[PDB]
Amino acid sequence: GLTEEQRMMIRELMDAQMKTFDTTFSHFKNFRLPGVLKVSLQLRGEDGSVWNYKPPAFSLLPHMADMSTYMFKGIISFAKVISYFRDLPIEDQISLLKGAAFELCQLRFNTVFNAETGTWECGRLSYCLEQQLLLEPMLKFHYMLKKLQLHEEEYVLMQAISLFSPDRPGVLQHRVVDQLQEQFAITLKSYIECNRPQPAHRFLFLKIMAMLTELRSINAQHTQRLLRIQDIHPFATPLMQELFGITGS
Amino acid sequence: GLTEEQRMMIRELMDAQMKTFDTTFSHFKNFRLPGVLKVSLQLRGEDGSVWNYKPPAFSLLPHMADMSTYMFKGIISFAKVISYFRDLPIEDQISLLKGAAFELCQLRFNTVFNAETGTWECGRLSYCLEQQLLLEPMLKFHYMLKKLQLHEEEYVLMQAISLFSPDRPGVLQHRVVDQLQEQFAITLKSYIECNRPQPAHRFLFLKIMAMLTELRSINAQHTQRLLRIQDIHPFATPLMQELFGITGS
Ligand SMILES: CC(C)=CCC1=C(O)C(CC=C(C)C)(CC=C(C)C)C(=O)C(C(=O)C(C)C)=C1O
Ligand SMILES: CC(C)=CCC1=C(O)C(CC=C(C)C)(CC=C(C)C)C(=O)C(C(=O)C(C)C)=C1O
Numbered sequence A, B: 001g002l003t004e005e006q007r008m009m010i011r012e013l014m015d016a017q018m019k020t021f022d023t024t025f026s027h028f029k030n031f032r033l034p035g036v037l038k039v040s041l042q043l044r045g046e047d048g049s050v051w052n053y054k055p056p057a058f059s060l061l062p063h064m065a066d067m068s069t070y071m072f073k074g075i076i077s078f079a080k081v082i083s084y085f086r087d088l089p090i091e092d093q094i095s096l097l098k099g100a101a102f103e104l105c106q107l108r109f110n111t112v113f114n115a116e117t118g119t120w121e122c123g124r125l126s127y128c129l130e131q132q133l134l135l136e137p138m139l140k141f142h143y144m145l146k147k148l149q150l151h152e153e154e155y156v157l158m159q160a161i162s163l164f165s166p167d168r169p170g171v172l173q174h175r176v177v178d179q180l181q182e183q184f185a186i187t188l189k190s191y192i193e194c195n196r197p198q199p200a201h202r203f204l205f206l207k208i209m210a211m212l213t214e215l216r217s218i219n220a221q222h223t224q225r226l227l228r229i230q231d232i233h234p235f236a237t238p239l240m241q242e243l244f245g246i247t248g249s
Helices: A004-020 A061-080 A090-112 A137-147 A152-163 A174-195 A204-232 A238-243 B004-020 B061-080 B090-112 B137-147 B152-163 B174-195 B204-232 B238-243
Strands: A039-044 A050-054 A119-122 A125-129 B039-044 B050-054 B119-122 B125-129
Touching: A004 A061, A004 A152, A004 A174, A061 A090, A061 A238, A090 A119, A090 A137, A090 A152, A090 A204, A090 A238, A137 A204, A152 A174, A152 A204, A174 A204, B004 B061, B004 B152, B004 B174, B061 B090, B061 B238, B090 B119, B090 B137, B090 B152, B090 B204, B090 B238, B137 B204, B152 B174, B152 B204, B174 B204
Parallel strands: none
Antiparallel strands: A039 A050, A039 A125, A050 B050, A119 A125, B039 B050, B039 B125, B119 B125
16 A cells, blocks of 8 residues: 555646656757657648658767657756755766666656657657567667556656666765665555556566666666767767766867 | 761760760769658768658759759750850750740650659669659650650750750741751651661651640740749749840849
């Protein structure tokens, strides 16, 4: 059963989620495009028209970097609006964000992902996959997590656990961030047993937990893959530089 | 049989054609697009990618107007490079061009038209039709003319007959332009009988001739349709204004 302290956590968590997550990507514009994986782009005009992009043979980097910044921006507003986060030392908020930005983005990106059609529905924008080449970690992750069929509560809770990780470079309040994370995980574990008594959801809390661990490694591996592509062909935005620790030098 | 005077006409005609007709639209760029009939657009990137546009529900006007200007420009270089044209009074060259621009463009546009797939192949650009609604004059024209399966000689000759029309507003050398036109039509009529003795090509010269007459009316009707759309929603380019007689006032 959920305590009133648990109900209160989920609430202030769901609230921040609806206040900082533009599920129809309305305010995302002025973004770069490929000019003139295997992801095809689709842009449904406000007027009914449609612009479709098929890839060649890069090129889609600038755009993906703009989508990422719009996403990161939301994720940050998400953190600063949660009491538990706001009450930490400034330095620790930056350490935590730089730590989970990628993970929180992918967690949100998974909710607009369609496993049936293999596409990310982002408002008027669409990212379609061009099929057992889930040989791609990030890809198998989206399908696996999408398969679990989680509720919004579970997703925002996963976002909490990931955000408040004590095991992150430069985290000063190592102890607080840890207790907080334990509290979020407890609330999750409880929410599951209070609302999903069916056999199919047995071990759900643990699958979720393992998922967040996999996601942590994927995050480590992608950061590297990204910093390598950035070294030879700069594309990262000012905000991404700040997140991935680039000095502009 | 073709005289040496006829062979010479066709030649200086074919020459001007290859010198002013960019059949792969290479130097056509910096054009406007629909931002963010039933013609869908396709742009095959130099890198292998493809941008596809599906229409709604206008919008494609600006672009079509840019294609038209690139086309007109070619058609004008075509005229100024032909001896018979160059040797007319300046005033008469403008009268003739303003008269046939549309027709000469459609004549050239028909050679990159594919009746099998209903699309205009223009280099890296494609204009696909989105099927007995050849209820559209200009459309039935392209299919009919494409059906005749003409040779390049015949097309450039049709371009001549159309360009040197004495029956055009403001033509001073009414008499010369007439004899010239008669000469081009004779050469055509001759080329046909010297190279197409098969039953299928009987009356070809006359079909061609009727076609140019239909095209003349279509031209009259489209100019009007265009000037009407221009009055409410200006899109025509400086060059089109000059051709359709707009003062910029
Ligand atoms: C266009 C979409 C939805 C995903 C492609 C994509 C991605 O969205 C990501 C990872 C996400 C995936 C592969 C679903 C994130 C993108 C940026 C940080 C710009 C990604 O890291 C990536 C890479 O190529 C890295 C390995 C450098 C990537 O290509
Ligand atoms: C996009 C393509 C190849 C054809 C569409 C098209 C055209 O290409 C034309 C006529 C040609 C057709 C319909 C094959 C010419 C276009 C301009 C002068 C900009 C045309 O007149 C037209 C019109 O709508 C008029 C009636 C105003 C037109 O829509």
